Amino acid sequence: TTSILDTYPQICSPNALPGTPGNLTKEQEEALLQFRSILLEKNYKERLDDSTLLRFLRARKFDINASVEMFVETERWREEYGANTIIEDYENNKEAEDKERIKLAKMYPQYYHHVDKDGRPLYFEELGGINLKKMYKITTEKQMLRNLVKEYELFATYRVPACSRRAGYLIETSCTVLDLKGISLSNAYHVLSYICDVADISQNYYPERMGKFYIIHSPFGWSTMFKMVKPCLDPVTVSKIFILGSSYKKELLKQIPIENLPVKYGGTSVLHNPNDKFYYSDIGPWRDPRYIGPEGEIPNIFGKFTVTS
Ligand SMILES: CCCCCCCCCCCCCCCCCCCC(=O)O[C@H](COC(=O)CCCCCCCCCCCCCC)COP(=O)(O)OCCN
């Protein structure tokens, strides 16, 4: 076929939220057809699939005019910023890129690790080890945004097809755990511009990619800092963010299989080599040959240090 979308499910579970592929109303089906017809008339050719277009439509409550405007601006940004070649450009410089990513990994753990009960990629970030002075020595704010965009492209390219083949339904979103244990509120206020730039790119160019977003171990007074963040967040974004209390492990176990959840977050999941570190790891359906398709296997984001079991 040479059409990757033909090799994994393009309809979501019937238990998914409204407006999702396979779960549309008659009016929403007609909106999708009218939306695609407009983009085709404007000579767009790429990213016109049901999943992509319904993400944009859900983000705009199926307002077709607003959705076209959003899609048109996204395509412009992708071209101007280089999102369309980010993976290729990465691979053509993989050595240096890998080296820098490794430097940040212990300080700012970012790792996918199996899936939630619906098959979404299970994603973790730990923020309490960040030292700003040291971080500003290894990276720039624009570089971190580039890394975020690159991961958005890797998510769609490798993680969605593999997770969807395993779930037997289309997977569009992440189950994300943000661990704030040990952060300084001072640091948190100093990085407000980065958080809002992240929300900007997320909301404007990768609509409807959030699924579950849990914040755990937030310190006393964190509610005050979050009030600085909310004006950067759209209503739907805020709706997917769940700030967990001291019973966070039980909330996590409502959504995540115990065997997929790390021991320190309330499950039984361990690495195959107990000395390996989660911040060098990338474990999930996209590492299983059963579930990798014609897209190929994902590149190793930590080079030789990448831990895949
Ligand atoms: C040169 C270096 C200088 C750079 C300055 C910053 C350096 C340190 C970077 C750490 C500070 C920010 C950390 C949080 C960043 C925002 C969210 C990160 C996770 C993320 O990608 O979430 C997406 C963004 O959505 C959202 O917008 C979700 C909003 C939730 C954010 C809550 C705010 C956290 C406050 C704690 C900060 C602690 C600071 C300690 C220094 C949606 O989620 P998904 O499920 O689609 O993502 C998983 C698939 N990619």
Swiss-Prot record:
Ranges for domain CRAL-TRIO: 100-273
Matches recorded under SUPFAM superfamilies: CRAL/TRIO domain, CRAL/TRIO N-terminal domain
GO molecular function, one term: phosphatidylinositol transfer activity
Source superkingdom: Eukaryota
InterPro entries (alphabetical): CRAL-TRIO_dom (IPR001251), CRAL-TRIO_dom_sf (IPR036865), CRAL/TRIO_N_dom (IPR011074), CRAL/TRIO_N_dom_sf (IPR036273), PI/PC_transfer (IPR051026)
Pfam families associated with the record: CRAL_TRIO (PF00650), CRAL_TRIO_N (PF03765)
Miscellaneous: Present with 2870 molecules/cell in log phase SD medium.
Protein name: CRAL-TRIO domain-containing protein YKL091C
Organism annotation: Saccharomyces cerevisiae (strain ATCC 204508 / S288c)
